[PDB]
Amino acid sequence: YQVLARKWRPQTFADVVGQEHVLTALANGLSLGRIHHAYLFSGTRGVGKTSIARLLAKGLNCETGITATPCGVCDNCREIEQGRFVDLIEIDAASRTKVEDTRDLLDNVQYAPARGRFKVYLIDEVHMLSRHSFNALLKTLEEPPEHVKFLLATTDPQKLPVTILSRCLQFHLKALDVEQIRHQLEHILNEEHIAHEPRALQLLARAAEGSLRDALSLTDQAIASGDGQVSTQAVSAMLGTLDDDQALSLVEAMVEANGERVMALINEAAARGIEWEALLVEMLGLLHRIAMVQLSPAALGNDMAAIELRMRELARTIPPTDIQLYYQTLLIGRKELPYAPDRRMGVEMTLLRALAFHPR
Amino acid sequence: SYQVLARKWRPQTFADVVGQEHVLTALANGLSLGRIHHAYLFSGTRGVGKTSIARLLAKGLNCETGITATPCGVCDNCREIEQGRFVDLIEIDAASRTKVEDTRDLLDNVQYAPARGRFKVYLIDEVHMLSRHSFNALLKTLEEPPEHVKFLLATTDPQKLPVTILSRCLQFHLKALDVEQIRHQLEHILNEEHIAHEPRALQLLARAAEGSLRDALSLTDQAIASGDGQVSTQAVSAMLGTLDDDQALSLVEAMVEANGERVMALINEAAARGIEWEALLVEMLGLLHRIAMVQLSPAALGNDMAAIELRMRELARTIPPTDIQLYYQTLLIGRKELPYAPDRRMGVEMTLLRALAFHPRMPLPEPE
Amino acid sequence: SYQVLARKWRPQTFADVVGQEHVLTALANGLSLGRIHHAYLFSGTRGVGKTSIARLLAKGLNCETGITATPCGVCDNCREIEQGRFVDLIEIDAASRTKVEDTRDLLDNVQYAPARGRFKVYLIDEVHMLSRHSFNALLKTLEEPPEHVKFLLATTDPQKLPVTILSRCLQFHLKALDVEQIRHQLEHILNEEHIAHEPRALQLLARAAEGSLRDALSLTDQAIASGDGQVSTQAVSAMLGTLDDDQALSLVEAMVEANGERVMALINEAAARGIEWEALLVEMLGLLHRIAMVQLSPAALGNDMAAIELRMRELARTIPPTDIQLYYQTLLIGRKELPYAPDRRMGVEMTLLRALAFHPRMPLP
Amino acid sequence: MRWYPWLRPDFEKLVASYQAGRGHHALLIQALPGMGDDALIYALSRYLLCQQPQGHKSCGHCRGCQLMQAGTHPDYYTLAPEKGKNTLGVDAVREVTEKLNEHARLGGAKVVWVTDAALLTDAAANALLKTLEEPPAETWFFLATREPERLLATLRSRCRLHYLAPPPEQYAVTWLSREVTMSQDALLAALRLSAGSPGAALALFQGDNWQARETLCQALAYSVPSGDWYSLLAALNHEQAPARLHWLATLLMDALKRHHGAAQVTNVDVPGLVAELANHLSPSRLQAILGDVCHIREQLMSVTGINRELLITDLLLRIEHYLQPGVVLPVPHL
Amino acid sequence: TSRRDWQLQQLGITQWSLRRPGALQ
Amino acid sequence: MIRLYPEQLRAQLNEGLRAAYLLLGNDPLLLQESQDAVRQVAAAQGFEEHHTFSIDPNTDWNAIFSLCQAMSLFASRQTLLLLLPENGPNAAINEQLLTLTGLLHDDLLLIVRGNKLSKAQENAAWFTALANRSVQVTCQTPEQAQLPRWVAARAKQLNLELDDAANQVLCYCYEGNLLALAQALERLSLLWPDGKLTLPRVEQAVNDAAHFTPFHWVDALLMGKSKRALHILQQLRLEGSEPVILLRTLQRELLLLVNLKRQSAHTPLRALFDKHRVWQNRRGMMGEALNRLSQTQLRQAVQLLTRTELTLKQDYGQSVWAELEGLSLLLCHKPLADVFIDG
Ligand SMILES: Nc1ncnc2c1ncn2[C@@H]1O[C@H](COP(=O)(O)OP(=O)(O)O)[C@@H](O)[C@H]1O
Ligand SMILES: Nc1ncnc2c1ncn2[C@@H]1O[C@H](COP(=O)(O)OP(=O)(O)O)[C@@H](O)[C@H]1O
Ligand SMILES: Nc1ncnc2c1ncn2[C@@H]1O[C@H](COP(=O)(O)OP(=O)(O)O)[C@@H](O)[C@H]1O
Ligand code: ALF
Ligand code: ALF
Ligand code: ALF
Ligand SMILES: [Mg+2]
Ligand SMILES: [Mg+2]
Ligand SMILES: [Mg+2]
Ligand SMILES: [Zn+2]
Ligand SMILES: [Zn+2]
Ligand SMILES: [Zn+2]
Ligand SMILES: [Zn+2]
After folding, report:
1. C6 to chain B: nearest residue by CA?
2. How many Cβ atoms are within 10 Å of B113's Cβ, its own excluded?
3. Domain at F1-142, CATH homologous superfamily
4. Is B7 near ligand 2, meaning CB less than 6 Å away?
5. Phi then psi dihedrals of residue B155, to 5 deg
6. Domain carrying residue D287
7. Smallest Cβ distance to C299: which of F28, F204, F230?
8. Among B101, B326, F98, F322, which is least packed by CB within 10 angstroms?
9. Domain with D271 in it: what CATH number?
10. Where does the source fall among the domains of life (chain D)?
């Protein structure tokens, strides 16, 4: 068994979710015969940098010809997919950082390709190379031989030397939106014949934070813990999704400066067992909604109708500056929550500071 | 099939070099008078063209027509140098040739006369990567080299070289090219290549180049690839000019006027358009900074954004400096807070709401 | 076929040497009285003339006429030594011969008596680059030096040498040449070269030399090349402006004077050069801190800031301490805020403008 | 390594997946110290490496079981910080990755255990990224950590997360009473200080930690009436300084809770000290001191080789300075 | 002294007041 | 064992020789002068062959033992010199020296040169055995107080007229480096055969080559000499000394001062000194430092030290020396506007 993130790797440009601009640029370059000798794909975590690089290599080294739509059936494509293609050399740039490795690699750039037409050096995680390695690379990257192509993939482009960036064609990937992630998850689950519900997929997409690998990992967690079913209850339990009015009650108690009730609610929540970061995020969202309502009475969305009245009351009592102050205090508490002796201690300290902030 | 523009459009004569007038004039005067030194060091940023100037000097020294400031470019020596095949042009990769053994070998093989040319030009690239032992070995040879030996050095970081090496050489520091020169060079290259272009696309590419001309050429290649054989304003804006739109200025004006409804409508329109929030904050901060500079010096605003010049000047006449500083600080702090916000759009909305709440002139109404 | 001024113009007699009076006088007296130490070490900064003085001493020791303080310069031995062809003159370059097997072959040849000269001089340059075992062999040789063998050592950094070698050698430290001496030498060389010059150009070149006459000659060659055979003040000013690196101190001075135009010009110049902005802010903070320290006590500055000591002391005298503290705090806040600014140049400009005009409001209790 | 009863349920889940050939190749277990996650990982490894498993339990007789008991199984790999050091280097990760390229000697699965992923340096994590992404066949990675939010995002985004939680306070108190013999208030205070982890409270009781806590309480009781906080240095300067700083922080937080009229307090065995702290200190000073203590604890735990005595002395001097009238208290920043 | 200044300080928003009007041009 | 000083060796050597000689100290100049004098006397007494070896576990003792046991073809009264390691003798080296001691005889003359031995190193079977028939020379670099006397004696020996101002200038410029002082005196004598060393003559032929230690810097800080402290810090920076050692050396004294000042309000100072086991000579300096500054100082100094350590370690900065200079000024009676302290 192979995990979903390792089984559903794209094999053609038609299978790539989003990143339309990069694919269009690559297709135009291949069609017009304007292939460059240095490509640097920079993006966030899990946005298909390695997949795009591998597909570009397949297109460059396809038997039929240089095409933007590799066949995927010729021997070159099959060997590249399997990973035992001689002319495609994939460096790690994390297990091989010393200058000797780079220097000996740069001494093998003269020999012609064994089987293919281009010698493709795919350097992944290139941001973990020493300065000497970059300096050695520079001149070869500037004017390499005709039969050699360099592909670079990094998640931290600002750690590279400026010259390295200037010597390469940069493609900046964009984080996938919620709808695209949800659609991809639905398609994958349909192909795999796994039950699912719209709410579960929506929650998983929202929690993915724009990374598809994270979405697939969460889906695998749900499948393992959901008895082979992606149900709303299982996803909510895994993600600790607040459902009742704990956030609103805590916000009201904090505004009223009733420390006793705040501490009682904190103790009750701890006894129940709740993810503190989710609670802080919900409180921040409620504060933002109250501020929006203060800006305009119609900002309140229908979704939070059950508490609308209560929300409006706060909008009629809390000055906007106090709302901003509470929002920033909760944000700071969220930032420092990992670096605390305990998560509950951090939450309590943040809420006590907010209680002490009463300017009236 | 087409070779990269950066490699193809390499200056093969001193007339093709863009800018760097002082260095070219000094080299031409030295060659014409005959006062030729044995150690030249070139320093500057990336893409200024130190290597190109070194190659041109090597061509000038070793030319069958004699030592001339304007090499013919047709004689076999010039052709070989252009093709990188001349036997009397020893190019050293200091990045890979760092160990002192290579330096010792080079100094041991420095006494023999050149094969065909009248000089044996050693061009060491990235000299700043050599170890101290290599520098010490090269010291004496640089001090009293053979008459038929010339040393040319180029680096990006001359601050880490030994002081003695700096003392033993003629230094030439190249400065970054300005926007106009980069734009003119791009226009000339595109005209030669027979590719359609628009003035604003060239302006955006030149502004994004940031001195380095090789960066400009790489961005031009990206624009050509994106536009499918044409360099259009929309094509350039898709990848680079995602920012610099009138929406940022409209939002700034609305915030200055405390028009909450207008700000909210602009935010909704930007969200519909799919505008990156961090880029929007960056643009607002930049506009505020340029207004502050206009307040300081009337000449701060150049022709680059002349299209909005008038409007900007108005914001300079009315808004007191303290309000501008308050807005700038608030937006900067909101940018600090953006990564930890529950959502990017929510973070930007909260930042703008905080800015409106503490508006110096008309704060939002308080509860009663 | 014009020759480099540094290479063409080299000292040939103790009279030609500029400055370094104490070392020359001591060597002359020692040679006259016959007091010749078995090992001499020369130390100093770049371009002070260690190798030149060593070669002149070698000429003096082996001169045909006798052991004279001032060599004749006409006899065969003097000419051969000047040309580097003398039989008994050995110029070991320790930089390219740090290996033990290379130094041992010479310390063994030390045994043989000189063919022609009285002494078999061993001139070892850049001696600080030798290996530990090479130092041990040299120590043995210095412990048992034959009466017909002398050793001359030149090194810019004598600290690296073991203390034993220093103890078994007579040290001579060459002081950095003064501005007036460098200016006079440049004027003499140009007059003998039949090249037009201006006094301000000579003064600027001497100031830029920073005590190294070799640097002065290199800058003179650059000025001649730029000026088309004339050392004009305009060419020297242009060259210095192109290679000027004191932009941080100029920015500090402009900020103190509250002159926005000069600050903008300096910022543009720095942008053209490509200097890192965070490094520029760090340098400005360091300069402000050192000026404050100077205000606290004049002994803050030493030889490190000798290049810009006068300007720093003037700023310390003029600026009240409170303004310096305020500027330091403003620049520190600007450095803190720089990462979040959209452009580092933009952040630097904002910080400088804030320091110029916008006074921070000190937080209340 | 002790097998606590409350680990029985979770195990029954995880092993089940490995019985169906659907187990993830990288498992990250989140658990507080003393929760026994190491025992769970060891049990899973024993089951995986067993050649003739008997349902959910290792046979204990096959060659794999014998080698694991002897701790000499060729296919079993462990990454732990070297003796004395408190970090895991790049060299060990590189060695393990290079070894993984070869087939298992016993023709079975290969298990790699990381004792604590939080100790990994940036270079080690980056090196391990690609190997974790596409490990060879029949390769399983087990990782353990306390707070998965500190691990590198790329490393986090390619592992199956499993969270463990402590049982209800009543069950933990009953278990501690069965094991340890102390007053109910002492057991409850130890459990609360341990963030609900039964194992940590047992560790605190077993040793001199309780005596150190009593000494710290006595020193603080002496110091609070007067302005002499520097005397606490003797009680704080020690190898286990973070734990004592945590105890002081809990005491200050309980004092603040009492000031606000709350009901539950972390320390339920020293009411007099909490009352004295509340009476003699204002809420703002308590908050400032708590923030300073937390920041100093974080600095001590993060920086390598930082001087303990100097930092503690500076903290005590600043705390004494704050108590003086007309002193600007610090404000949190981001 | 005003509550607005206290809130601004708590928010970390540094407020700057010009001291050299003649510098601006 | 006959203990002596380098100024009293010529008379002893003229009176007679000894089975072995031990030269322990730190100053190279005095050690080499004693070695040269001993070798010259031995040669005058017929010791022709001289051999030198550096003590090292890598070095083979078989050759040394064979040389000691063997007899020269046409020579007698050989001299053996042993250079001890800087760190000090090891157990294996101690055993080798014990073995060598037996091989010693009348003709062989052993001379040992090396750094001063600690209490544990001094305690050795071979050293105790040789103490009965050994002469030891104490070679300690004179302190700044004792330096002018040594300089005047050196000038008188070489028949040079040295003024008080010239003596002070020479002491200041070449403090802690006697070899430089001797070479400077030789150069000055060569420059002016008349020997009239006036102040301008010395000022025009002297360079700064002083050598210091962190303990000297801390002592200067306690004294309050701002100029001396700054000079010492600059010299330490120039010679390339890690600031960590300076920080740790200053930390102990700073904490001791803080504790003493805190406890001084209730106990006599002498009792506190006795309890803390402070050196007798340092008691006056400690009392002067305590009376010079109050609790207002020594508290901001701790903040400066902590901030400097954090900058050094967390941030890996390079402005450590500026902070050290600021702290040095703060310890001295200076305003220190306190914006830098970041209180
Ligand atoms: N833009 C994308 N389109 C399709 N799949 C993606 C994309 N981004 C990530 N993935 C998923 O992530 C896995 C590959 O990781 P990848 O994103 O290529 O690594 P990188 O972090 O280098 O981009 C695949 O299983 C794939 O399904
Ligand atoms: N002054 C210039 N004029 C025209 N083109 C230039 C100039 N400087 C750089 N270029 C272009 O930039 C490319 C890279 O220049 P390069 O030789 O790398 O300079 P450097 O050595 O300073 O990096 C060249 O191929 C050339 O086409
Ligand atoms: N004292 C001096 N007087 C005249 N010229 C000098 C002096 N010192 C250095 N120079 C000039 O510097 C050039 C090279 O000197 P160099 O051998 O580099 O000295 P060093 O060994 O001290 O660096 C010579 O050509 C010489 O003209
Ligand atoms: F494979 Al990645 F960021 F997860 F490049
Ligand atoms: F080749 Al360069 F700066 F000289 F990139
Ligand atoms: F020749 Al030099 F220092 F430059 F001795
Ligand atoms: Mg990848
Ligand atoms: Mg180049
Ligand atoms: Mg020289
Ligand atoms: Zn194919
Ligand atoms: Zn030609
Ligand atoms: Zn002669
Ligand atoms: Zn088994």
Report:
1. B143
2. 11
3. P-loop containing nucleotide triphosphate hydrolases (3.40.50.300)
4. yes
5. -160, 160
6. 208-329
7. F230
8. B101
9. 1.20.272.10
10. Bacteria
Atom of ligand 6 nearest to the CA of B167: 4
First to last CA, chain B: 74
Residue D2 lies in a domain: yes
C63 labeled part of a ligand binding site = yes
Task: Provide the CATH number for the domain around residue D192.
Answer: 1.10.8.10
Chain F hits for D300, CB-CB cut-off 8 Å, are none
Domain boundary among D158, D186, D207: D207
Contact F322 C289 (CB under 8 A): yes
Chain CA centroid to CA A168, Å: 24
Domain spans, chain F: 1-142, 143-213, 214-311
Tell me the two tokens of residue E9: 């300080």
Find all residues with CB under 8 Å of A283, minimum gap 6, and list them: A247, A250, A251, A330
In chain A, alpha helices (H): 4-7, 20-32, 49-60, 75-82, 99-106, 131-142, 162-166, 178-192, 198-208, 212-225, 232-239, 246-256, 259-272, 276-295, 308-315, 320-336, 343-356
Half-sphere exposure of C24 (CA within 13 A, CB side): 19
Distance CA A44, CA A15 (A): 19
From chain D, which residues contact E within 8 Å (Cβ)?
Answer: 331, 333-334
**Is the C-beta atom of C214 inside 6 A of ligand 3?**
yes
Report the C-alpha gap between D237 and B13 in whole angstroms. Answer: 73
What is F143-213's CATH number, 3.50.50.60, 2.60.300.12, 2.60.40.10, 1.10.8.60?
Answer: 1.10.8.60
The whole-angstrom separation of Cα B125 and Cα F270 is 69
C-alpha to C-alpha distance for D106 and D64, rounded to whole angstroms: 8
Domain assignment present for residue D334? The answer is: no
Domain made up of F214-311: CATH architecture: Up-down Bundle (1.20)
Residues 6+ apart with CB under 8 A from D43: D3, D11
Ligand nearest to the CA of A64: 10
Last residue of a domain, one of D176, D207, D238: D207
Could you tell me if D24 and D161 lie in one domain?
yes
The residue type found at A316 is R
Q: How far does the CA of residue A191 sit from the closest CA of chain B (Å)?
A: 31
CA distance D59 to D52: 6
C-alpha to C-alpha distance for C81 and C88, rounded to whole angstroms: 9
Helix (H) or strand (E) holding E5: helix E3-11
User: Does C72 appear as a known binding residue?
Assistant: yes
Q: Which chain F positions have a beta carbon within 8 Å of D306's beta carbon?
A: 309-310, 313
3-class DSSP state for residue B173?
Answer: strand
Of residues B102, B111, B173, B167, the one with CA closest to residue B139: B167
| B327 vs B255: CA distance, rounded Å | 9
Mutate to test the interface with E, among B294, B313, B323, B326 (most CBs of E within 10 A): B326
- Tokens 């807005």, located at residue: B327
Ligand 5 binding pocket (C-beta < 6 A) is A 163; B 46, 50-51, 154, 156
Query: What is the 3-state secondary structure of chain F?
Result: CEEECHHHHHHHHHHCCCCEEEEEECCHHHHHHHHHHHHHHHHHCCCCCEEEEECCCCCCHHHHHHHHHCCCCCCCCCEEEEECCCCCCCHHHHHHHHHHHHHCCCCCEEEEEEECCCHHHHCCHHHHHHHCCEEEEEECCCCCCCHHHHHHHHHHHCCCEECHHHHHHHHHHCCCCHHHHHHHHHHHHHHCCCCEECHHHHHCCCCCCCCCCHHHHHHHHHHCCHHHHHHHHHHHHHHCCCHHHHHHHHHHHHHHHHHHHHHCCCCCHHHHHHHHCCCHHHHHHHHHHHHHCCCCCCCHHHHHHHHHHHHHHHHCCCCHHHHHHHHHHHHCCCCCCCCCCCC
- Residue ranges in C96-176 assigned as alpha helix (H): 100-109, 132-143, 163-167
